[PDB]
Write an enzyme that holds these catalytic residues in place. Structure first.
Site, PDB file in Angstrom:
ATOM      1  N   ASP A   9      -1.916  -9.964   3.257  1.00  0.00           N
ATOM      2  CA  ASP A   9      -1.951  -8.838   4.306  1.00  0.00           C
ATOM      3  C   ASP A   9      -0.723  -8.989   5.390  1.00  0.00           C
ATOM      4  OD1 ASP A   9      -2.898  -6.506   5.277  1.00  0.00           O
ATOM      5  OD2 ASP A   9      -4.851  -7.390   6.174  1.00  0.00           O
ATOM      6  N   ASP A 104       0.861  -2.766   2.407  1.00  0.00           N
ATOM      7  CA  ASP A 104       1.077  -4.131   3.154  1.00  0.00           C
ATOM      8  C   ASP A 104       0.252  -5.136   2.492  1.00  0.00           C
ATOM      9  OD1 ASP A 104      -1.548  -3.828   4.436  1.00  0.00           O
ATOM     10  OD2 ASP A 104      -0.738  -4.662   6.370  1.00  0.00           O
ATOM     11  N   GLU A 105      -0.533  -4.882   1.481  1.00  0.00           N
ATOM     12  CA  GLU A 105      -1.512  -5.751   0.930  1.00  0.00           C
ATOM     13  C   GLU A 105      -1.699  -5.845  -0.318  1.00  0.00           C
ATOM     14  OE1 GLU A 105      -4.733  -4.215   3.702  1.00  0.00           O
ATOM     15  OE2 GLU A 105      -6.154  -4.547   2.105  1.00  0.00           O
TER      16      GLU A 105
HETATM   17 MG   LIG Z   1      -2.206  -5.498   7.850  1.00  0.00          MG
HETATM   18 MG   LIG Z   2      -3.125  -4.179   5.072  1.00  0.00          MG
END
Ligand SMILES: [Mg+2]
Ligand SMILES: [Mg+2]
Length: 342
Positions: A9, A104-105
DNA sequence: CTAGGGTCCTAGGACCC
DNA sequence: GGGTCCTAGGACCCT
């Protein structure tokens, strides 16, 4: 038979990217979001802004009352997408068992990995280090035997840290874990659960599955399982986009169909260009429209339709405007498409 | 003072058996 | 009455 699941993350993702690309933003409070004049919200904020209480999804006027010097940025989505592609490729160096959950993850299943002597802890650390090298952005990570515990874990030692939850540690971790921290238990559910005396997983463990199923349906089964560390969901690297939508909230409410129509004319080219990247022939399963009124009720109407068509969207929006607006003002107009199945 | 990008679940009637 | 499709609405996820 115990899997190793990593959740990776990025920290303050949109804000981290803007600070890398402009070091002058590093130590002043910044946030990506629409201005208060545009009735916007905060997408995210850096740690200097969060110190003032600025949070994702906060109305921008509230953010500014908390933090008067907040520097507001519009967002550079190709810059974020580019860093997204780059970390996913970094993930691929370690496994193909990659399930992205947003830009983003991602979940990673490294159960069958040969890297770092099969240590999931060291794999996560190498990935975070590699992401800092190569992109100059930091990431946090969580390591656990199932998805949801790994995703909870990546928040616990953020920014630029990680957290490992072993099977031996699962029961102690669960006992005091607030239900609201389980992904998919949101504010509404947590408030219903709280109002019956259920705050933590330890609280739910003392509950009957049959009761949970009557009072919450399939959600009550998920609640019962998660409160025991049960999460058999597999990391799935084969998920595909099912929809695409384009909507805008205007700075002032509208009350005339001419205004609504003018907005659709600008929305439509954007919907077309985005669909065409994924489906050049514009062939789709359904298309539809969305209005949100000034009382914040929202309506959608959509229908089977074989190919993106502006006039039918205008027509549908016309009916919706006439048939279920009831004289209130309109703050958002949206267009929408459901993608074909394969 | 309340975004924009999405996924998944529920639920009634239509339709099919 | 059981599947399944159609459609609408809503909780929830990410930044
Ligand atoms: Mg994040
Ligand atoms: Mg994220």
């Amino acid at each position: 038979g115990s899997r190793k699941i990593i959740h990776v993350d990025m920290d303050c993702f949109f804000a981290a990217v803007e600070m890398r690309d402009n070091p002058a933003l590093r130590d002043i409070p910044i946030a990506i979001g629409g201005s208060r004049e545009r009735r916007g919200v905060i997408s995210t904020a850096n740690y200097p802004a969060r110190k003032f209480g600025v949070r994702s999804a906060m109305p921008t006027g509230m953010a500014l009352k908390l933090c008067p010097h907040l520097t507001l940025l519009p967002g550079r989505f190709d810059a974020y997408k580019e860093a997204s592609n780059h970390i996913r490729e970094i993930f691929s160096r370690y496994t193909s068992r990659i399930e992205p959950l947003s830009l983003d993850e991602a979940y990673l299943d490294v159960t069958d990995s040969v890297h770092c002597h099969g240590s999931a802890t060291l794999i996560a650390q190498e990935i975070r280090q590699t992401i800092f090298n190569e992109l100059q952005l930091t990431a946090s990570a969580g390591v656990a035997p199932v998805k949801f515990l790994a995703k909870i874990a990546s928040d616990m030692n953020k920014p630029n840290g990680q957290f490992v939850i072993t099977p031996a540690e699962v029961p102690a971790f669960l006992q005091t874990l607030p239900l609201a921290k389980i992904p998919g238990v949101g504010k509404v559910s947590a408030a219903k659960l709280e109002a019956m005396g259920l705050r933590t997983c330890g609280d739910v463990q003392k509950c009957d599955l049959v009761m949970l199923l009557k009072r919450f349906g399939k959600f009550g089964r998920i609640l019962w399982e998660r409160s025991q560390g049960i999460d058999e969901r597999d990391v799935n690297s084969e998920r595909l986009r099912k929809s695409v939508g384009v909507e805008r909230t205007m700075a002032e409410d509208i009350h005339h169909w001419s205004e609504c129509e003018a907005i659709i004319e600008r929305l439509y080219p954007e919907l077309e260009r985005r669909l065409a990247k994924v489906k050049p022939d514009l062939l789709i399963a359904r298309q539809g429209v969305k209005l949100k009124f000034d009382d914040f009720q929202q309506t959608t109407q959509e229908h089977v339709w074989p190919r993106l068509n502006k006039a039918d969207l205008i027509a549908t929006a016309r009916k919706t405007w006439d048939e279920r607006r009831g004289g209130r003002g309109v703050r958002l107009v949206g267009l929408h498409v459901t993608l074909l199945d394969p």
